[PDB]
Each structure stands twice: as structure tokens, then as C-alpha cells.
Amino acid sequence: TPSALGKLQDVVNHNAQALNTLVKQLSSKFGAISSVLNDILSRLDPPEAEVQIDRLITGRLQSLQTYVTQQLIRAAEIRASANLAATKMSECVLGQSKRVDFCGKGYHLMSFPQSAPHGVVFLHVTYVPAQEKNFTTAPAICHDGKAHFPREGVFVSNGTHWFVTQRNFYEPQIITTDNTFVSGNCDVVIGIVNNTVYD
């Protein structure tokens, strides 16, 4: 992919083009007789050419000011990018961020920084689920006249049986009293089903 490392090439090209534009305005006369200072110092009256030299100074001084302003703007942008990179190094590399899409697409596991010219590259190792199958679910289960709710997981349907499994990976387990907690009766929950809770 050619557009992989463009953001750093763009910065270096912007710097090079700013330098070239600054060095190109040196050949500009800005409405004067010429741009070569030695010729103006050797083709006019020394006491009279002062007002002519004043025009070249303003043309070059204001160009330097525009260059400095554009450099300040680019420095602000690069400092924002560097603050983002430092936050990403502290949160994605030095830890495991729970922020979505901040340390890569998917559930972030870990990151590895890589040195780059005038930049940094993060290798975001993420967790992407795949091969999903759909089942029938229920908010609660009524066995002993009392509604049971899963402690950590979701009730799924075997087609003819019911299981409890974690919400990020299909691992069926028998619905026992250790996987569920009882709270309230059964006439207050919508969608509750009947199934035995193993003791």
C-alpha cells in the first residue's frame, strides 16, 4: 500500500515546500527594479536608493513572518498529533484500554510501538469475533416459582435445551445455582421461560 506512510511523507513534504517557497521569494523583486541586492547597490544613487532598498526588506521580512506563522500552525498540528500519540502509548501500550476504536478496530488486547522517522507506528493487536450462530434467549428462568438471572452470561437455546454462556464466546454450561442468582418472583418479568435449575 503506497498510502500507508503518507502522513509522515506529507509532513516532510510540507516542510520542504515551505523552505523552498521561502528561498524562492529571495529572487522576487516585490515591484522593485530587481532582486539582486548587489545590482541595486551599484546601479542607483546611494543616498536615493534607500527607499528602493526599503521595498526589498519589507518583501522579505513579511515573507519570513508568513513562514513563521505557517510553521506555528503546523507545529500546533504536530503537537496535537504528538499528544494523541503519547496518550495512545500510555493507554494502548502501557495498558489495555476499554475505549472503543481508540486502540484499533475491535476489542483491544495489546499494542506494540515502532520507531518511525518523525513519527510512531502502533501495532494494535485486537480481538475480533467470528463464526457467529444465533439462538433463542430469555431474560430470566422460572424454576422454583422464582425468577433466575445469569450472574455473568446469557441464556441460550439448544433447540430443545437451555444453557448459560458468556456473551463473547459460545461455551454452553448447565444452568446451575452457581451460574444464576435469584431475585423476585416470575410474574414481573417479560419473556421469562420455564427451565430446571440444577442444584
Binding site: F30, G31, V100, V128, P129, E132, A140, F181, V188, V189
Partner: protein, 172 residues
């Protein structure tokens, strides 16, 4: 800088090539606006469509889901937001993404979060009932899942009443 006078055009060169440096800066700003919109709305790779049956366990998303009877397929809140909000050398360039495409991205983000929860942001869109995904968010904020199921009618009414007041809040 010159308009129509030809005597100025050749005289502009002796001052400098600033017209070239400035036009390259405005093009960067112009392409930045198209990148800003894509970074916000183009986060999904698939356009999820809302189911034909609009039942979500008592919750009512009519004020935020697209209205097929209205033009531009905007929602009432988007309608209110839209209703409330060639010269001498200067031109206005049209955005790369039209308002109908941004509205479609918003519909995809909205239809996905109501039918798949947060699963479509990390990978494939895993279908899940809305009272089921609402219990996961309650379990995330620090309250058990039974609090939602035992009060689903109350929470649904508080949600529907709060969304209805958003239009009044943004209008008044």
C-alpha cells in the same frame, strides 16, 4: 487581485507567486472537511437497516429513526435541526458527502445500535433484543440486570418521555 485588467496579470508576477501558495492552502482545508465527515459518520462498513416491526420492548425510537413519508428520509429531530440552522473571484465547493448520505450513515449507526448493541463496532453485527442489551448497560453502570427487567415499563416510559422533550428543548 486583478479582475479583468490584463495589465495587472503580468504585473502580478513581479510581486510574487502568492496566488499559488494560497490556493494550495485552501485545497488542504477543503479536503480536510471531507476527511472530518468521514471520520465521524463513515465508521461503519455496512449500512444496517431497521427491522420492519418497530417494537423494541416498549422503547419508541420514532423521533430518531428515519421517516419514510418525509423527504430526504430525515427523522423529526433531524428535520428540526435542518429547519433551525458565484462571487467576485470566490467559489463555494460542494461537500463530497451529501446530506442524504450523512443521514444514511446516521441511520446505519442508529439501526445498528438498536439491533446489535455495541457488537457492530468491534466486529460483525450480533443480533440481540433491546431489553437484553439494556441490561448489559445497566450491568456496566453498576446495577444488576434484575433492576431493568423488574422495571422495564417504567424505564421505557422515562425513555420515551425524555426523547419527546428533546424537540421542545431544542426548539424553545
Amino acid at each position: 487581485i486583478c479582475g479583468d485588467s490584463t495589465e495587472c496579470s503580468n504585473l502580478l508576477l513581479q510581486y510574487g507567486s502568492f496566488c499559488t501558495q494560497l490556493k494550495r492552502a485552501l485545497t488542504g482545508i477543503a479536503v480536510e472537511q471531507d476527511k472530518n465527515t468521514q471520520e465521524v459518520f463513515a465508521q461503519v462498513k455496512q449500512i444496517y437497516k431497521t427491522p420492519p416491526i418497530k417494537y423494541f420492548g416498549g422503547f419508541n425510537f420514532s423521533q430518531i429513526l428515519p421517516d419514510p413519508s418525509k423527504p430526504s428520509k430525515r427523522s423529526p429531530i433531524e428535520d428540526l435541526l435542518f429547519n433551525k440552522v458565484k462571487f467576485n473571484g470566490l467559489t463555494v465547493l460542494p461537500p463530497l458527502l451529501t446530506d442524504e448520505m450523512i443521514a444514511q450513515y446516521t441511520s446505519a449507526l442508529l439501526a445498528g445500535t438498536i439491533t446489535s448493541g455495541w457488537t457492530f463496532g468491534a466486529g460483525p453485527a450480533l443480533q440481540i433484543p433491546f431489553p437484553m442489551q439494556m441490561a448489559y448497560r445497566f450491568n456496566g453502570i453498576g446495577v444488576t440486570q434484575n433492576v431493568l427487567y423488574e422495571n422495564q415499563k417504567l424505564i421505557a416510559n422515562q425513555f420515551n418521555s425524555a426523547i419527546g422533550k428533546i424537540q421542545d428543548s431544542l426548539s424553545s
